[PDB]
Amino acid sequence: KPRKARTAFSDHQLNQLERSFERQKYLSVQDRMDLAAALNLTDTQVKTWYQNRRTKWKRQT
DNA sequence: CGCTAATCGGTT
DNA sequence: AACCGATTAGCG
């Protein structure tokens, strides 16, 4: 069952994703597309990163 | 083993 | 179409 390679986010990308999450728990389609483009990530990579980050936030609360 | 990226099926 | 919760799985 082929899967995608695990993305290794740069420190710059993780820093900017965490910054975005501190500002907004969810992104609009537009804001997700803008952040993806700004970080040279796919829309899916940013969507999944935000989904998993909300899961972690739920657990740590 | 812990952290977390990616995948699956169900919910809305 | 995006999310959620459960799950699978890569790597330090």
Residue numbers in the entry: 231 to 291
Sentences from the paper on this structure:
Transcription factors (TFs) recognize specific bases within their DNA-binding motifs, with each base contributing nearly independently to total binding energy. However, the energetic contributions of particular dinucleotides can deviate strongly from the additive approximation, indicating that some TFs can specifically recognize DNA dinucleotides. Here we solved high-resolution (<1 Å) structures of MYF5 and BARHL2 bound to DNAs containing sets of dinucleotides that have different affinities to the proteins. The dinucleotides were recognized either enthalpically, by an extensive water network that connects the adjacent bases to the TF, or entropically, by a hydrophobic patch that maintained interfacial water mobility.
Another sequence, DNATC is also only one Hamming distance away from both local optima but has an even weaker affinity to BARHL2 than DNAAT. The recognition pattern appears to be a mixture of DNATT and DNAAC, with the hydrophobic contact of DNATT between C7 of T7 and the methyl group of Thr278 retained but at a sub-optimal distance (4.3 Å). The water molecules are arranged near Asn282 in a somewhat similar pattern to those observed in DNAAC, with the water net connecting the side-chain oxygens of Thr285 and Asn282 and N7 and O6 of G17 (opposite to C of AC). Thus, DNATC combines aspects of recognition from DNATT and DNAAC, but both types of interactions are less optimal, explaining the relatively low affinity of the BARHL2–DNATC complex.
